[PDB]
Curated annotation (Swiss-Prot):
Section of the entire sequence shown: 106 to 384 of 384
GN (gene name): PROK
Binding site for Ca(2+) 2: 16, 260
Cysteines joined through disulfide linkages: 34-123, 178-249
Lineage: Eukaryota, Fungi, Dikarya, Ascomycota, Pezizomycotina
All copies of domain Peptidase S8, residue ranges: 7-279
Required cofactor(s): Ca(2+)
Enzyme Commission number: 3.4.21.64
Annotated protein name in UniProt: Proteinase K
GO terms for biological process, alphabetical: proteolysis
Domain of life: Eukaryota
Catalytic residues in the record: 39 (charge relay system), 69 (charge relay system), 224 (charge relay system)
GO molecular function: metal ion binding; serine-type endopeptidase activity
Cofactor note: Binds 2 calcium ions per subunit.
Residues bound to Ca(2+) 1: 175, 177, 200
Any one cellular-component term (Gene Ontology): extracellular region
Length: 279
């Protein structure tokens, strides 16, 4: 399949070179997989989701996305024009209020929710969770994300936008999940992206165009925008049968574009998510 004039990050993840604008992918497109988006909620009624998005859980007075950030991330996972996995199922878990913040105990309770709720869902090709959130180091937040991974979900988390070692953040610093940094369209590490030995992979993070609340679109930047590129890729790759939840992060790292990014500090991996699809 070929989507012309695609957003640059989509084209990048199906390209050995920067600077192109067509996204190539196997038409299976994540059919039969499920991605949980744990964030401010999802405007499921957005036409870009085609009835494939829905809210399954909130810890606040509404499951509505009154922020946009969770909607934007879900759009990068699986919307028709901006999504990596254009046929996946999207499940929203509103752990962040409409200002984008949430207590760690609420965040922990949402991760434990997904590790159980997946048993209430039809996802024969596998389960992914995309956590575009984070704060300072917490062993209880790390262990919550470890548990979710352990239950059989591929967990993708953002490295953080502090331009610093991600060892001091959570769940970025948990080793058993997939910690994602951000790059830009010239294959530079995004200026805000955290780095360090705990990072596993880079995805497109700067000026990422996706769905927004109110039926609209907009372009924003952040390692929360790289994370859903990798989450969506995992779901896409599990549907093709090329990997499982437990080994998706390692498979993505093994098959990535090596050595293509600049301003990657010594000791950080130089790997860019790549679907390796040959049209």
């Amino acid at each position: 399949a070929a989507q012309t004039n695609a957003p640059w990050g989509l084209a990048r993840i199906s390209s050995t070179s920067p600077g192109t604008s067509t996204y190539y992918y196997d038409e299976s497109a994540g059919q039969g997989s499920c991605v949980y988006v744990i964030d401010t909620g999802i405007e499921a009624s957005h036409p870009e989701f085609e009835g494939r998005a829905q809210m399954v859980k909130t810890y606040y007075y509404s499951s509505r996305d009154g922020n946009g950030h969770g909607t934007h991330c879900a759009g990068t996972v699986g919307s028709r024009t901006y999504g990596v996995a254009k046929k996946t199922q999207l499940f929203g878990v509103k752990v962040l209020d409409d200002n984008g913040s949430g207590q760690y105990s609420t965040i922990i309770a949402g991760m434990d929710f997904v590790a159980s709720d997946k048993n209430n869902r039809n996802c024969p090709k596998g389960v992914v969770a995309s956590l575009s959130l984070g704060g300072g180091y917490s062993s209880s937040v790390n262990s919550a994300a470890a548990r979710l991974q352990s239950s059989g979900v591929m967990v993708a988390v953002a490295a953080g936008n502090n331009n610093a070692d991600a060892r001091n953040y959570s769940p970025a610093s948990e080793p058993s999940v997939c910690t994602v940094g951000a790059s830009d369209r010239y294959d530079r590490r995004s200026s805000f992206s955290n780095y360090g030995s705990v990072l596993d992979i880079f995805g497109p993070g700067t000026s990422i165009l996706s769905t927004w609340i109110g039926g609209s679109t907009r372009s924003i930047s952040g390692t929360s925008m790289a994370t859903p590129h990798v989450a969506g890729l995992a779901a896409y790759l599990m549907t093709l049968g090329k990997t499982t939840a437990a080994s998706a992060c390692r498979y993505i790292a093994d098959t990535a574009n090596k050595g293509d990014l600049s301003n990657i500090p010594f000791g950080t991996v130089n790997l860019l998510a790549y679907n390796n699809y040959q049209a």
